[PDB]
Homo-oligomer: A and B are copies of this chain.
């Protein structure tokens, strides 16, 4: 399925820019009945800050897991940009009919207005809530009603924004430099982009993970996908010479005797027109994806060996596995080069550290043959860094085409030889193939120039490191196709059209920015789960999802150890500054979001002395304690974990003042008789009987005038007194004039994805297509 491997990589569909449409508030104002100093009702209600919804569970592990869920919710509601004018609605009652920032801010403004006891000092301040528009500086301000934690999130989302201004010079500079200064391509535009035009640039940081280090099975899949991609971009060979008209000339050069079984009939095998541009595509695409090939030949076909000589001229020996390479070099050497000087057959041991070229360079007396052998011996790429990325650039003499002139001057020395130990038919059998190649001197110089120019131009759109490691599975290259590429090239230059150049660059940038933003997501989640003590979270799900969302990898075939090794080398990376600042806000306000709700209590103090119930305005009388100061703390969660229950048993059997610290439920007792009846110490015997504290459900009193039979407080001069005190925090008042802020943004801009949609592209006619040396590629007649 090499056509669905291509579909996974052509359909990366880059990161959709997320505009904010809400405010991300966590709290909300809710009005509560308030009470006097003695428990009687103050006549008014008072607005406070409460959670909008709570799913704060009882176990502290579940609490910190809930804030990791909240962190992921923030990450899924991070705006890539925003326009405050698109979410701003009017308040119903201001002087100048202004606009607040939110429908929920407008709901708060319309609830504080037309409420009976707001007080005038506030109702004048709603009437002054108006937006402020600077059209010169493109800066607007909207009134907002936000909690300080919520305003930290919102001020963060405003200030640290992804958009960057755009013009025509930035779309000049978005095209990579090696096409931008190319003579062969002409690029113009049609639109002057305005002063208010934005884009979100991709994340083009290189491989922070180093998948080429040890992930051989994943990087095999990567080089497979890069190979199938680059194969579809290498252009088709145009105007080859005719196949049936080249086989006739080939069968006239060597003289086909019809009765003699001879080795020159098999020169003419498999020379096609589609094998030619099969070979051309795979020679460029395996060198663009840095993917190792493997040779397929028969050793009786000697034209395969001569085309393998040209194959090892142009392409470095490190592009092939050693078995097929060293076997081909062995057959080339044994057949053509060693019978020239009457040498031994060279028994060559499998496992020699030196290839047969690397000892034919020292056994052979000739200079020319051996000089070309030494070019092939230590032919390798230069490891280059241009424009931030690695390149693996060829030798200059390869991309001149001059090394074909080095080969043929070393090839017409094997025709001068006499073959002293071999018969005359074998001498004809070698030098017919030598003549058969050397008829195409300029044609192969031009084919080498064309291959190297297309290699340069197509690696000019690669945005990842072209790491040269031997790949795993090492796909097939046939030498019959190399032979049918040596013949049948002709005259017509084909260079890649700049539409396909831009398409190859686009899908490279799409997969690379995908890959980097996924790394940022997963390193943020793993670092956030390590910095909040999540000792029961198995992190196979994070890395499994990380390979799900990369649309290439077969994730059901990557087992445990590779997932967990990606976990090992993923949390060595620093978090992106965006998600790090998000986690800093979560980590400094998480301890306040936890303590600001009902259905949670952060501890229970059991002293056995008579502690009076405390007054506050919104309950009347509570057993709220506000510090764990003076009491021996016992962590509830660690207790649940280790399962001891022998320290707290020996502190509940005898009556010792004790402080069970941990998130817990409560019931709200309201009656006074059920405080006169000591329901405090009743709920802790179940810890001793059954050895579990997940049942543990303490009580919070609200002795108020709204309760039944409050008169025991009123008529008897009784400041109420309980045995235990649960550990809650008191809600904060909704100060209206201090919660109002002003949100700051731009008024108008537009976001442009696909920057290359504005560049209209053209190429010079390929008769005059020019190389790096200011000479034409394929200057043959």
Interface residues of A (CB under 8 A from B): 214, 216-217, 220, 243, 245-246, 248-250, 252-256, 258-259, 268-272, 275-276, 278-280, 282-284, 286-288, 290-291, 321-323, 326, 349-353, 392, 418-427, 429-430, 432-433, 435-436, 439-440, 442-443, 451, 454-455, 458-459, 462, 466-469, 471-475, 477-478, 480-485, 487-491, 538, 556-562, 564-565, 568
* A351-B279 contact, Cβ under 8 Å, with A433-B253, A484-B271: no
- Please give the distance in Å from A543's CB to the nearest CB on chain B: 13
**Contact residues in B for A424 (Cβ distance below 8 Å):** 321-323, 326, 350-351
**Contact residues in B for A560 (Cβ distance below 8 Å):** 443, 490-491
Q: Are A440 and B558 in contact (CB under 8 A)?
A: no
Q: Are A458 and B259 in contact (CB under 8 A)?
A: no
**Contact residues in B for A245 (Cβ distance below 8 Å):** 556-559
- Please give the distance in Å from A257's CB to the nearest CB on chain B: 11
* A459-B288 contact, Cβ under 8 Å, with A271-B484, A275-B484, A473-B252: yes
Residue of B nearest to A278 (CB): B481
**Contact residues in B for A216 (Cβ distance below 8 Å):** 253, 432, 435
- Please give the distance in Å from A394's CB to the nearest CB on chain B: 9
Q: Are A217 and B252 in contact (CB under 8 A)?
A: yes
List 13 extra interface pairs beyond A246-B559, A254-B436, A351-B423, CB under 8 A.
A217-B252, A243-B488, A249-B558, A255-B425, A255-B473, A258-B425, A270-B484, A276-B489, A284-B455, A288-B458, A290-B467, A290-B469, A291-B474
**Contact residues in B for A272 (Cβ distance below 8 Å):** 488
* A423-B350 contact, Cβ under 8 Å, with A245-B556, A269-B483: yes
Q: Show 29 residue pairs from A and B whose CB-CB distance is below 8 angstroms, ordered by the A residue.
A: A220-B252, A245-B556, A245-B557, A249-B558, A250-B436, A252-B473, A253-B432, A254-B432, A255-B473, A256-B429, A259-B425, A259-B426, A259-B429, A275-B485, A276-B488, A279-B477, A279-B484, A283-B451, A287-B392, A287-B455, A290-B392, A323-B424, A350-B424, A351-B422, A351-B423, A351-B427, A353-B420, A491-B538, A491-B560
State the copy count for this chain: 3
Residue of B nearest to A422 (CB): B351
Q: Are B480 and A420 in contact (CB under 8 A)?
A: no
Q: Are B291 and A475 in contact (CB under 8 A)?
A: yes
Q: Are B451 and A255 in contact (CB under 8 A)?
A: no
Q: Are A254 and B429 in contact (CB under 8 A)?
A: yes
Q: Are A349 and B443 in contact (CB under 8 A)?
A: no
Q: Are B485 and A279 in contact (CB under 8 A)?
A: yes
**Contact residues in B for A483 (Cβ distance below 8 Å):** 269
Residue of B nearest to A325 (CB): B424
- Please give the distance in Å from A256's CB to the nearest CB on chain B: 8
The 10 tightest CB contacts between A and B, nearest first, are: A279-B481, A275-B484, A351-B421, A276-B484, A322-B424, A279-B485, A276-B485, A254-B433, A350-B423, A245-B559
Residue of B nearest to A474 (CB): B291
Residue of B nearest to A458 (CB): B288
Residue of B nearest to A253 (CB): B432
**Contact residues in B for A477 (Cβ distance below 8 Å):** 279, 282-283
**Contact residues in B for A451 (Cβ distance below 8 Å):** 280, 283-284
**Contact residues in B for A482 (Cβ distance below 8 Å):** 279
- Please give the distance in Å from A569's CB to the nearest CB on chain B: 11
**Contact residues in B for A276 (Cβ distance below 8 Å):** 481, 484-485, 488-489
Most B-side CB within 10 Å, residue of A282, A478, A559, A568: A559
Contact of A435 among B253, B284, B480, B491 (CB under 8 A): B253
Contact of A561 among B392, B440, B455, B485 (CB under 8 A): B440
- Please give the distance in Å from A450's CB to the nearest CB on chain B: 9
Q: Are A443 and B561 in contact (CB under 8 A)?
A: yes
Q: Are B557 and A249 in contact (CB under 8 A)?
A: yes
**Contact residues in B for A557 (Cβ distance below 8 Å):** 245, 248-249
Q: Are B565 and A439 in contact (CB under 8 A)?
A: yes
**Contact residues in B for A561 (Cβ distance below 8 Å):** 439-440, 443
**Contact residues in B for A287 (Cβ distance below 8 Å):** 392, 455
**Contact residues in B for A253 (Cβ distance below 8 Å):** 216-217, 432-433, 435-436, 472
